Amino acid sequence: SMKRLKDLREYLAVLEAHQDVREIDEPVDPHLEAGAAARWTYENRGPALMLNDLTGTGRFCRILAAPAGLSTIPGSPLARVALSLGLDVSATAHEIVDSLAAARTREPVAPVVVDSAPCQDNVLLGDDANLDRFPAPLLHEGDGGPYLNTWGTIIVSTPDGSFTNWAIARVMKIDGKRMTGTFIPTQHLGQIRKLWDNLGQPMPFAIVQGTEPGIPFVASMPLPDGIEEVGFLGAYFGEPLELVRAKTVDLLVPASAEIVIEGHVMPPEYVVDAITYRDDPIWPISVAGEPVDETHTAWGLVTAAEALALLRAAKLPVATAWMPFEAAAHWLIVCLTEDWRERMPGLSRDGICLRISQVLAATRIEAMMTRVFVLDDDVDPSDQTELAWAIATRVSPAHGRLVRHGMINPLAGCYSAEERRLGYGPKAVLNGLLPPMAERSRRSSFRHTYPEPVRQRVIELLA
Amino acid sequence: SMKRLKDLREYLAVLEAHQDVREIDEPVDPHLEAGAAARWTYENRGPALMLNDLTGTGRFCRILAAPAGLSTIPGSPLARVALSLGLDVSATAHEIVDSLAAARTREPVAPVVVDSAPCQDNVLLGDDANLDRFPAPLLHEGDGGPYLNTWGTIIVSTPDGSFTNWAIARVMKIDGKRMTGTFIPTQHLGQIRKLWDNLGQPMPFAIVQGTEPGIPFVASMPLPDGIEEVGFLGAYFGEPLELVRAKTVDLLVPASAEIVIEGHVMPPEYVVDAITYRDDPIWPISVAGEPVDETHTAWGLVTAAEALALLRAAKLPVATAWMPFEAAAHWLIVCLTEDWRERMPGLSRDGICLRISQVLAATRIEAMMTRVFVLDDDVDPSDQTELAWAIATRVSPAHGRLVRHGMINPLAGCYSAEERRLGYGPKAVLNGLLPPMAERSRRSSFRHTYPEPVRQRVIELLA
Amino acid sequence: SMKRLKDLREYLAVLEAHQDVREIDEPVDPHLEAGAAARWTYENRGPALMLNDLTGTGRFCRILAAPAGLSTIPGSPLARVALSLGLDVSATAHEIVDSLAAARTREPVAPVVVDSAPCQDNVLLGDDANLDRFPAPLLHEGDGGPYLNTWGTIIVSTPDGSFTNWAIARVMKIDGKRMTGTFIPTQHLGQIRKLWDNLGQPMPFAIVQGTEPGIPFVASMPLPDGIEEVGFLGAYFGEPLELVRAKTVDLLVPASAEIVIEGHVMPPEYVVDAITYRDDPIWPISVAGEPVDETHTAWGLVTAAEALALLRAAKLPVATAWMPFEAAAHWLIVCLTEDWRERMPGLSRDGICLRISQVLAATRIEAMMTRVFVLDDDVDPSDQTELAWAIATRVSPAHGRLVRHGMINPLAGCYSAEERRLGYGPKAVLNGLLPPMAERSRRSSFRHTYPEPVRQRVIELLA
Amino acid sequence: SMKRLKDLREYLAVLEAHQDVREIDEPVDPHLEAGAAARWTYENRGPALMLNDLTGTGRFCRILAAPAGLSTIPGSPLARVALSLGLDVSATAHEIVDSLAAARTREPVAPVVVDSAPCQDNVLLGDDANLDRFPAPLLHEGDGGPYLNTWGTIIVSTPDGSFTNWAIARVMKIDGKRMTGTFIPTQHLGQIRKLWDNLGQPMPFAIVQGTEPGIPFVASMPLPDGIEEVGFLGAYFGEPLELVRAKTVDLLVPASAEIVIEGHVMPPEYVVDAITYRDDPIWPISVAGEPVDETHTAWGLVTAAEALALLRAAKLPVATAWMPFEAAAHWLIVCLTEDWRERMPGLSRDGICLRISQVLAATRIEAMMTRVFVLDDDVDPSDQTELAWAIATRVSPAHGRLVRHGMINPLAGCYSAEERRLGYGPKAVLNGLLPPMAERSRRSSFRHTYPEPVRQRVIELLA
Ligand SMILES: Cc1cc2nc3c(=O)[nH]c(=O)nc-3n(C[C@H](O)[C@H](O)[C@H](O)COP(=O)(O)O)c2cc1C
Ligand SMILES: Cc1cc2nc3c(=O)[nH]c(=O)nc-3n(C[C@H](O)[C@H](O)[C@H](O)COP(=O)(O)O)c2cc1C
Ligand SMILES: Cc1cc2nc3c(=O)[nH]c(=O)nc-3n(C[C@H](O)[C@H](O)[C@H](O)COP(=O)(O)O)c2cc1C
Ligand SMILES: Cc1cc2nc3c(=O)[nH]c(=O)nc-3n(C[C@H](O)[C@H](O)[C@H](O)COP(=O)(O)O)c2cc1C
Ligand SMILES: [Mn+2]
Ligand SMILES: [Mn+2]
Numbered sequence A, B, C, D: 001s002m003k004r005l006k007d008l009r010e011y012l013a014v015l016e017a018h019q020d021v022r023e024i025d026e027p028v029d030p031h032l033e034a035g036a037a038a039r040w041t042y043e044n045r046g047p048a049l050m051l052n053d054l055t056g057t058g059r060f061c062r063i064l065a066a067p068a069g070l071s072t073i074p075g076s077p078l079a080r081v082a083l084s085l086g087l088d089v090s091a092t093a094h095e096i097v098d099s100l101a102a103a104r105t106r107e108p109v110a111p112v113v114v115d116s117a118p119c120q121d122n123v124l125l126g127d128d129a130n131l132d133r134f135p136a137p138l139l140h141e142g143d144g145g146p147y148l149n150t151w152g153t154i155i156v157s158t159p160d161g162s163f164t165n166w167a168i169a170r171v172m173k174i175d176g177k178r179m180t181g182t183f184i185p186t187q188h189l190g191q192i193r194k195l196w197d198n199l200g201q202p203m204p205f206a207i208v209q210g211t212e213p214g215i216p217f218v219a220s221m222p223l224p225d226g227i228e229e230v231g232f233l234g235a236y237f238g239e240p241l242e243l244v245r246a247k248t249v250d251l252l253v254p255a256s257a258e259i260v261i262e263g264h265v266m267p268p269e270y271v272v273d274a275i276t277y278r279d280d281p282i283w284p285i286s287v288a289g290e291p292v293d294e295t296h297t298a299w300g301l302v303t304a305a306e307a308l309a310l311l312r313a314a315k316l317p318v319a320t321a322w323m324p325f326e327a328a329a330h331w332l333i334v335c336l337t338e339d340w341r342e343r344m345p346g347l348s349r350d351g352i353c354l355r356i357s358q359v360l361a362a363t364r365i366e367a368m369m370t371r372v373f374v375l376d377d378d379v380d381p382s383d384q385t386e387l388a389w390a391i392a393t394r395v396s397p398a399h400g401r402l403v404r405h406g407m408i409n410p411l412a413g414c415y416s417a418e419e420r421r422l423g424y425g426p427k428a429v430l431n432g433l434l435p436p437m438a439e440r441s442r443r444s445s446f447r448h449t450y451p452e453p454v455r456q457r458v459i460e461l462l463a
């Protein structure tokens, strides 16, 4: 019973119905103002913004800010994430990660190729395919230049055409025909590029902006080597994604795109050969920084869903997994089922944390996990207060800590300059599991400490 | 320029003007319902409750629930704390702890004795002084009996009459004439009681309920041995507190009280000799449990103010100190001034954390501090999200941790059964200080990453 | 200027000249007595033993116990190791590991094939090739059966015949024609065996006993994948090793052997097809246990030499490396040169320990290192007392510890049952490096604290 | 059945009978040579030295070097300690500490005052009482001046004359009439001196050299406040010590002394008022530095005996305690009895280490213990090799460590400059206890792994 939104226009019409998108008709400068407007929106939990008029390009190309920021919908802060993933506006943190992890146990669904798509209604080729026709937002004061890709998907195939990877990575503008980005060897973009460099040939690419809202979530997901994002998207929604042939390169791109940038990566510079776009195009942006933005609501969230799927595939009794937004995607919380001891009869609390550390260490997400807290499932790790309370009251100030040293996230802040320079530092697994305890010995709150007739009577007097 | 509220009636009239107190006219049972109503209020950030009609005693004695819970006043969650301490309704976490710590550098102000007070308008003596005339609330399902004192102040003097201690401690009802409580040797009540036991004489006492709202905050404050709470209250408000002579014991009690219970502690049982009360008495309660209640807003908060004063008296450059409510008064956050290196030229980051640990370890609050995080003052430790972000991004997963073993808080949850039974366990000091860094290299947010004209322009478009 | 001993007879004639081998003419039972005689010898630093008469087989096959135990030679406890490696009887711990590590920088020297060898003077084929003709020592009370290989070398080749591995592993007797051993996947024997199992063919093998004394040291050495022990032995001694063709299998074996057991490993059982031996054969044994035996003098020592070579190949300024015998080959000591800061200008003490941990973690010896201590080279890590003094006085009781979790040595004792069962546990790197300090501020001894004329004068009065 | 040696002449006659003292008749310079001769002796395990002829004072006053260094007596390295404490020349480490700890459970024995003593055969008063008559040894190149007291005992009484403390502390010569030393407030000399400073009066003192050999051991012992060393010595030997009245001060001094220096400590300088000595006086020295000297054989050893007595007084099942000489008196080893679980039924291994840490932390020796290792009593902590093997194989590389921060030993080397400057740093308790295990699963050696008839048979063949 999924409610898949098929393009960005549908996504925006749903947000508009819930009063969660605002149109700005006054001119906004892509030089710092658009980025500042996005930050204000994330930090104040404002509606997503449609910037209808940008200095330099006017009303030609709109900008969507905070596409998956925290929502204004009352009682539903995850509504943009939930709607993007075809779920109810009020889907909980656990329902979201559980729906993604459930799709990892399903067979991939091959996409379908359509003859035409709105993303090719306007086609710019040759000298007309120039990025100077579109906004070039300078998102933060100290950036090296305009970041053209922050929320769009980069599409590349291996030379044999047997495998296609979709990924979100930052791409900076050099000039009207050229862009650049960093190609990390631990990422699938970098791995695929090394195959094109070995054959001494430019790698064809496509960057798509403003696709259906579910695509950037799966493009940020650290799926295993050899699992295509498009097949996973298909298994997740229970139907094939519709793709259209790119105009100047042998690649298939989402037919739901607002804009398609096509070209080749030279031996690392992206060279633009064609730009295609649908009428009145919308270019979404994501302005990374402190909590809470799409680094947290999309990347950290889909990473938690992948961790949940990997831990369950190792037969661990994991109720849920979550990357708390307030910890800026530095932490993973792993919650065990109440009956984990019945399910894993041979391990102590320390033993199951050792096992979790061993399983996570064998995966491609292990370097991101600066800290993993292992807790009981009477804690909602998406509830900031309950999570902080559980860590303070259940994790020993000294013991129950398992430290591993190895590869680290170079963007994580909790490392010394020497650890960053070596790319070698500590990652911890912290044990916050309790011994077997009665509910009333580990809780003291309205829901957990009073009989149902007493709570009912209080609710009738006060609610 | 203090705005001291002189009794509970004034406090309640101020909360009523800000729509932060609600009257419940339907009957409420002191058997679990009153406690459940208090928990619902804390956990939902509801108005303080005036329970006007209690099963068993009717409308005789009202109950005030959540006297200093988080406020409903828009943008002012600490308003009940701020008003209780004579400050503006919108006083910040830092203004509150700074006002308390500033009073620790001032000379005590002796109280004044008045001939009469509303708290003695009604006097019950002999067989009439029976607690069965007042509500006996069973605050939580598993409690040993009714907790008569949770927010009132216990008053005792040393045998020589040279020193008087005011403290909040829990007192349980045994029957109509007798109550009990635990007398901890590390607390001033217990220390004073041991002096009365050495002379083989019953210790006279008084318990006051519903005094002016500033008294329970100073009665929860862990002031040094030999500093009277009444003298500190006087220095804090800049004027003498008015006291009245108790009717059957040689003690002075706050003239602002709603109820006064007088008696002697026998060799530990409290025996009631007299009960005095003002017309239409109000008996406030505090229902301890998970965050956020007065364990956090009063006890942890005044403990943070005492830590701030002790650290500043040791000439440490401490900007602020705070006990985060979400960590259930298990954690202390110490924020250093931006120029701490200029103020302490001979210490590294590790060195200043060593010094903080050494100073705190010599004080009477050291056993409460399961964790102390040392951070820079660009972090507001009362902001849940910014605090969690600073810890995740600035505290190493492995290093910068100073562990001390010793006396522990027996109520803290993060200890093993063996550590609790021995009263011996770990307490940590964690270093989250940064090396010297430019604002734009340690922050990425609206306020810190954009020029003032860009922010102004965004505020005019969106706010 | 090597002094290579070409067979076991030469090795024994050299030990006899230094009164470091004793002949036992009384009968000794291979059932526990031979093993007990070996343990007494290791633990009392006795001469190596030649057991001339064994219960069951008489004077047919002699047994050599403690072949490389600590020596009785005055002032030369490492003499058996030094002589085995072609060095002077008085070669120091550092000269030994440095000579082995220097050979890792040299090109391999291919062996030479000889037409005949003393190891084939007697040939047993078919039903005559029966292990019941030779001693079957039960080395420890609780062993599963007789350990036939403890100091001999197992020789196997890959199916293509392109690579030959020589290794010491324990082999237990089942009966007269069959033996067994554990084939670990991290070891080259196990890796080569998996290639024979994939082709569905029995793996040919040879076990050689009593070769020239340098071979078991290189057969215990954890050389990288693809480096043949025979080529390394050749580079080490500066000349080709002489090999002879095995009688029933297509393998080349050391011509210096006392006994050659040939056969095939079935899908894990070793099946004996031929036994060849020189007149009056000697079967050496190694009886593993507490310090000090060949587990320590050979395996831990050659592992320290390989660590020294790997650290120097990563351009680290390592003066020496050593596995202290008293720590039962659980610890590695890494000593940095006095001018390491001049050689590595960009790292602090913590930084260089991080780098050492990172380099060691990428090697095949990392799981053996339960602890690595990083020290200055004013400490001789082969001097028990000076080493214990340096650790106690230079390693912080709390900080300077880098913990990594991963694969562990299943035979190491410092792990819990859960860590052993998972094969996952902690390994530490401890920083004992000093800040820049004058000799007289870090030492207080005869050699370091008195002027040369004062020491000379004292030596003339006392020595 | 004690064999108490009543003076230094008897001690030296016993060492001479065991060929453990050597006379040097050639002249030796007290400027560095005597100290260098002492260091050579400790480090080479040489006989104690009698320096019969010193440059500057000739044959007047002899010097005894290495009075309690490791002995040359075959198989009896602790013989100087054992003889000093009235025990058999072959008394083990455990017999020594057990004999000292047993005396802590006995009532003190008051001394007896004798009318005359050999230490007053020669009396120097007034201007004749000049230290320039005796050697002034410069013990190490960088010392501030000559150390006149290194092995003698400082005697002081409280102003009321109710308590007398005997202690070894270093005393440096200023000139012929004046000396100086540091008066630490945690030591009994410093505490007693503060009482004399409060009354504004010079503290009378006496320094005795060359007393009976048991006195410097008890003078180095950190006995509790209010326990006199003389009473303990009396309880230890089972008889009263004989004291003689000092000539110019109201103090009692050992009648067995070689030299007595009397005077007053001025407001810290020692001023000499009288020197008394027996014919042909001997002035013993102790030259502190690296292991092994009297810092280790006396101070660390008697500290281990006091720890054993304190742990047993807290009803802990401690088999033995020892301060390993190789760890330079930085470490304490605590060995529990094999049946400790039967004796302490309610604690886990971690629990008993917590308890040991808690008990030790309440004592006056806690700051000296940089590390405490808790082990089973199948380990002899005085056996260097077995101790290193037990720590390497039984202490986890990561867990089982209890860190406490507090007062530290300013002379300990394992602290940073900031920890030393603050006098605040880490002290650890490490858990090396095993779970219940069969002897053959935790040992592998001659004594533990072979049946008694097999060992007997091997001993008859080899010993
Ligand atoms: C807003 C946003 C921006 C991102 N930017 C980057 C980036 O510049 N580089 C990068 O390596 N990963 C970035 N990621 C994370 C990757 O998309 C993620 O690691 C993904 O799994 C990569 O695809 P792959 O698993 O096929 O290699 C970003 C994610 C989000 C949501
Ligand atoms: C709601 C509330 C209840 C409290 N209950 C107790 C209690 O039962 N026992 C206790 O020792 N401290 C309790 N405290 C903390 C003490 O009031 C606090 O330690 C105070 O400083 C004690 O007074 P003293 O410093 O004069 O010893 C409570 C505090 C609050 C705010
Ligand atoms: C006395 C002795 C016995 C040994 N027994 C074993 C054994 O049974 N199994 C094992 O894996 N390694 C054992 N080793 C260690 C291996 O020989 C060593 O890991 C060697 O490097 C293996 O050869 P490879 O590096 O070619 O895999 C022993 C070493 C010595 C000196
Ligand atoms: C060779 C030697 C020299 C010593 N020198 C000193 C010293 O200079 N200062 C000191 O405080 N303790 C020194 N000690 C240790 C003290 O004697 C020891 O702490 C003793 O218990 C002090 O006496 P008290 O317990 O009565 O205070 C020395 C011990 C020995 C054996
Ligand atoms: Mn991918
Ligand atoms: Mn008080």
Ligand SMILES: [Mn+2]
Pocket: C165, C166, C167, C188, C223, C227, C229
């Ligand atoms: Mn090999």
Ligand SMILES: [Mn+2]
Pocket: D165, D166, D167, D188, D223, D227, D229
């Ligand atoms: Mn004393």
